[PDB]
Design a binder for this molecule. Structure first.
Ligand SMILES: CSC[C@H]1N[C@@H](c2c[nH]c3c2N=CNC3N)[C@H](O)[C@@H]1O
Ligand SMILES: CSC[C@H]1N[C@@H](c2c[nH]c3c2N=CNC3N)[C@H](O)[C@@H]1O
Lengths: 232, 234
């Protein structure tokens, strides 16, 4: 059982990278992949870079080059659900592009031709993630996570996302790309991110101040999820 | 005689003419993409049908580079013309590609730029020069310049206006180019976009696209055919 883990920023993968034993590093297509075991479990950790294309490139290499069984996307996110606070966890049951638009031809907003309107996360990955959340007494929300190539900082950007996806519990920039690639390779995935800001007018400041806290919380959650998938 | 030219088209209509001309053709179905290998007028090529959008294009370009390792990449297909002297059917050649929908300005990056990437991705000077040479020999009307990509089909209104304001110099807009340039950049692979105009991204761009997708395909395909030959034998 090999578990793939994808993080966008170094800060989001560094703590996990530090724990990987029998660690080997591969530099490819401008990305870095770290293989080895995390607390006894075989993993493949990828630092992709920010945005949809970087994450897609990275996920593609990870899949074709290491062949993981499942993909877990870790990292930070802007919280949209009213119950969310910095440090809290968001688990995807689904991912959709909030910035894709081909409605001129009758596709659903957010949907790209040749893809389903939304990519569903894997049920077992979701259940495991949630049992970890319960065992660690974490505050979390499960639901629609939307991705785009823009940092949401209130104003018009936030308004468009609320209009098109009022039920989105969070927004970020790599999730759906990873889901899309996993979809094309028939690989199950799940997003498990921690909130660094609430995508409003002060989100840049909040991101500066809470990225580290978000990276650590999601990172700990990924660690527990790996262990739970590996030994029930 | 030992060069392998990678060619990427998003839709089936856009790759079908080139595909039919491939000698000793074979097909590879992988990651939801299709790759056709063989030769084009004797030159070894690898033609990928990527699907629409930045992620589809990135996934395909990554598979193409990693799997077939072509020496250069040519992105063919249709596009919305933005430069004034462009008419449906005319050719657009990129000298650069930028995302018109990437925005991390809140952190000081340039509009269109993603962290870790240059603000724009430069196309290859030789591929560009060869393309202009083909344009001259075929006596076609064409424009060289910045091409911008996003995950939205530009249909006039604010979508179009924001693009003209943020990129006054952009000559065309489509949905895969920059994603392909981005992937080629990370692998350090020369690329060039050579597309043909199917609409002018205004209120009627969907209707125009319906009616002229075919001609855009024909014209970009003819150019691709001529460029492959040119790159192989001058
Ligand atoms: C430095 S760009 C923000 C990064 N962190 C995630 C993120 C956190 N908070 C937000 C993100 N992305 C967009 N809008 C937000 N409010 C995204 O996926 C990028 O990798
Ligand atoms: C069916 S979406 C349009 C496709 N054709 C290209 C295109 C032509 N004209 C336009 C395109 N894309 C966006 N806006 C336009 N006005 C894009 O790269 C997609 O692959």
């Amino acid at each position: 059982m090999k578990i793939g883990i994808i993080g966008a920023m170094e800060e989001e993968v560094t703590l996990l990278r530090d724990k990987i034993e029998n660690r080997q590093t591969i530099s490819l297509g401008g990305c870095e992949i770290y293989t080895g075991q995390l607390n006894g479990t075989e993993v493949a950790l990828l630092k992709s870079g920010i945005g949809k294309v970087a994450a897609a490139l990275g996920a593609t290499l990870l899949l074709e080059h290491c062949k993981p069984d499942v993909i877990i996307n870790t990292g930070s996110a802007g919280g949209l659900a009213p119950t969310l606070k910095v440090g809290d966890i968001v688990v995807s049951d689904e991912a959709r592009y909030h910035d894709a638009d081909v409605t001129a031809f009758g596709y659903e907003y957010g949907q790209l031709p040749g893809c389903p309107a939304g990519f569903k996360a894997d049920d077992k990955l979701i259940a495991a993630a949630e049992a970890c959340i319960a065992e660690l007494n974490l505050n979390a929300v499960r639901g629609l996570i939307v991705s785009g190539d823009a940092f949401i900082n209130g104003s018009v950007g936030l308004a468009k996302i609320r209009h098109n996806f009022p039920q989105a519990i969070a927004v970020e920039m790599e999730a759906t790309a990873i889901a899309h690639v996993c979809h094309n390779f028939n690989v199950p995935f799940v997003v498990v991110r921690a909130i660094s800001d609430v995508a409003d007018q002060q989100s840049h400041l909040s991101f500066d101040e809470f990225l580290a806290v978000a990276a650590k919380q999601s990172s700990l959650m990924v660690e527990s999820l790996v262990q739970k998938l590996a030994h029930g």
